[PDB]
Structure formats: structure tokens, C-alpha cells
């Protein structure tokens, strides 16, 4: 459904892209977003979908906008406006200078010290999961590996019972790829409602887990509050449950379709980190945005105070003006340009955990199950949203071609 074009928005710039159901979805979700970068399309368009908002279609604009928090505020970062307005997660709903004291804390609970401490656990789980599936000669990758591998590590990191995963994952899905069953507002409130007693408990009896660290944390050297803690913990939950999960599925689908790429990594495993970066570019999956703080002309376009602008992190790296042949996966790409983990002061702090989980997955899978394919006839469907994803991924393989390692 199309919202009436506001008086200030030039009609020639109208491109009715729907970020939650793009027209060319069947071609692939990155492919469907890439329609915004065909030859006839401007750098900055207005869609009347989802309440009406701007979309920057090119990496140069996306980067510039994320650097300029003065004009492009985090305070309303989701589309539609209702979701953006209800979105009060910490730190991402705050701009500098206010954001900063909270980000230091959030950066602590997922940073490299934490990851290295988890390295053994991550290793064991991946190998455990994969070795289980190996003689079976088949799996649904989304539920057999893509979900349980990162989620179990996160739940472990957070100190939360795995029993809760189906609920918490439903809530997170609705915030990024809504069913229609919940508003972002509703799902956010439910996640907050879950966390409240848990935070009170961790404050009374301080522990070593991510939630204890936040809940007992200090900001600017002063006591974080219960409300502040809730707002920060909920966001970590979203990060921990709905990013790597989805990226893993884009990567494995591709690897399942590309024997030559799998061979590359089988023969020269030392390339796996590079392959990781390139997959992060090619199958980049996040797209949120900002809200105009005041009337502002940006690349010859008059933006009005209150306007929302989608600034798709996904698109920077698929921009042919950043990467030649951007839809080709080249593990030896010399300059792998992307903004997959964001750009500007909100740049992802969990990226180290993401890379670790990615590289470990690539390394343990190809070592044990080097030869696999998509189940015959399966027509893989993607889903689009704040964070895009893969609906289902049935893999098959011959057990006789595997290695117990
Ligand atoms: C492939 C995996 C991931 C991708 C592609 C990704 C992407 C992003 C992007 C694009 C942003 C910026 C959002 C904005 O500017 O509005 C962001 C921020 C953030 N991410 Fe990641 N993320 C991933 C994994 C994770 C994980 C595993 C965690 C935590 C366990 C996490 C936690 C966070 C947090 C807390 C922020 C907010 C930082 C701030 O606002 O200062 N992310 N991420
Ligand atoms: C857009 C994000 C990936 C980033 C971390 C989780 C997420 C959904 C947010 O709300 C901020
Ligand atoms: K107009
Ligand atoms: K808000």
C-alpha cells in the first residue's frame, strides 16, 4: 500500500521499493535490493511503501549519511515510523555524544577478550553439531546448524537457558522480518518483559555473564539503571540471535552451489578468513536507517525534518562503484569494500564474534563434509527486512565422501 507523496518530494525520484517484500525477491534478496542500482535509478529515491521514506542506493551516500549523525539521527532508526519511534534500544537509538558512555559498556561484553575466552566452546559446538549430521547425508541447515550454533553460544554468553530460545527467536524475527502477528513495538515490549526479572536477579547476585556485566555495569563511572540495562540487554539479544544465524545460511547456500569455491578452501584453508570477508560483502544482509534532524539538502535533494532515510548497509558492497562485478564471489578480491557491519559511530561491536563463528563454521564444515548440494528440486526462498534471511536450506550429501575428523 502506497502512502501519498508529500508536497516536498519530487515525483521523478519516486521508486516504490518495499523493504519487507521487494519485487525481485525470488531472484535472491541481495539481487532484489540490487534493483536499486540499475542504470536508470538515482542515488537517492523516495518510496511510498511502508509509510514513505528515502532510500540511498549508493555506498558513497550511505557512508556519508552514517558519518553525519548531526543530520541523520539514530533516534528513529527503523522503518516504518511506528517501529522507529518505539525503538529505544541502547546504544543504537542514541547519537554522540550521549551514545558513547553506553557503547563502551556494550562493547565490553562482546569484545575480543570475550571472544577469545569463548574460542574453545565455539570450536567444540561447531564440531559437535557437524559430526552429528555427517553420517546422516542430509540436514535442514537453518535449524540444524545456522540457528543452534550461534544462538547456543550467545545464550551461553548471556547466561540464559536454552529452553527460552524458541520464544526469544520468535520475538526477534518479528522485529526484523514481521509475520504480521506482532508490531515491532509489541515484540520489543515482550522482550523487555522477559528480561526484567532476570536483570533484577543478576543485580542482586552478580555473575560473570553478559547480562550480569551490563546490569551491574557502570557508565561514565556511575551506576547503570535497571531501565538502561533492559534497553541494552534487549539489543544484545537481537544482535546475538538474528544476524550470524541468517548470514550462515546465505554462505552455505552459496557454497552448496559452488564446488569450485569449496575446492579453493579445501586446498588452501589459509584463505578462509579472506573468503569470510568476501562472503560478508556478497551476502551482506542488514538495512536500517536514520531520521532527519532538520531541513537539509543532501546531494541536490531537499530532505525535510522528520523524514526517514533508509541507508542499506547491504548495498554499499554490492555497489559496482565500490566493487567491479559485485555479484561475483572472488575469494582473492584485492579490495573487498563493504559496510556489512555498519559505518560511523554505531559500527558493529560483535563483529569479532561474527567472524570467529563464520570462519570456524567454514573450516569445520569443509573439513568434515567437503562435498554437498541443495536437495533436488528445492527452490530456496529468502525473506527481506531489517535483517534479511533464508527460509529453509535442505542440504544433501553422500556419507562415503565425508571425513570423521
Ligand atoms: C553477521 C553478523 C552481524 C552483522 C552483519 C551485524 C551488523 C550490524 C550493523 C549494520 C550495525 C549498525 C546498526 C546501525 O548503525 O544502526 C550493528 C550494530 C550493533 N551490533 Fe552487530 N551485526 C552482526 C553481529 C552481531 C552480534 C553477534 C552481536 C552481539 C552479540 C551484535 C551486536 C550489535 C550491537 C550491540 C550494535 C549497536 C552498536 C551501537 O549502536 O553502538 N551484532 N551490527
Ligand atoms: C540492525 C541491527 C543488526 C543492529 C544490531 C541488531 C539490529 C537488528 C539492531 O537493532 C541494530
Ligand atoms: K511532491
Ligand atoms: K525512538
Swiss-Prot record:
Keyword entries, A-Z: Cytoplasm, Heme, Iron, Metal-binding, Monooxygenase, Oxidoreductase
Q: Known Pfam families for this protein?
A: p450
Q: In which pathway does it act?
A: Terpene metabolism; (R)-camphor degradation
One of the GO BP terms on file = (+)-camphor catabolic process
Superkingdom of the organism of origin: Bacteria
Entry keyword annotation includes Protein biosynthesis:
no
Q: Does the keyword RNA-binding apply?
A: no
InterPro entries assigned: Cyt_P450, Cyt_P450_B, Cyt_P450_CS, Cyt_P450_sf
Q: Which cofactor does it need?
A: heme
Q: What chemistry does it catalyse, as a reaction equation? A: 2 reduced [2Fe-2S]-[putidaredoxin] + (1R,4R)-camphor + O2 + 2 H(+) = (1R,4R,5R)-5-hydroxycamphor + 2 oxidized [2Fe-2S]-[putidaredoxin] + H2O
| UniProt binding sites for heme | 348
Entry GO MF terms: camphor 5-monooxygenase activity; heme binding; iron ion binding
The family classification in the record reads: Belongs to the cytochrome P450 family.
What name is this protein filed under?
A: Camphor 5-monooxygenase
Organism, scientific name: Pseudomonas putida (Arthrobacter siderocapsulatus)
- Name the encoding gene, please: camC
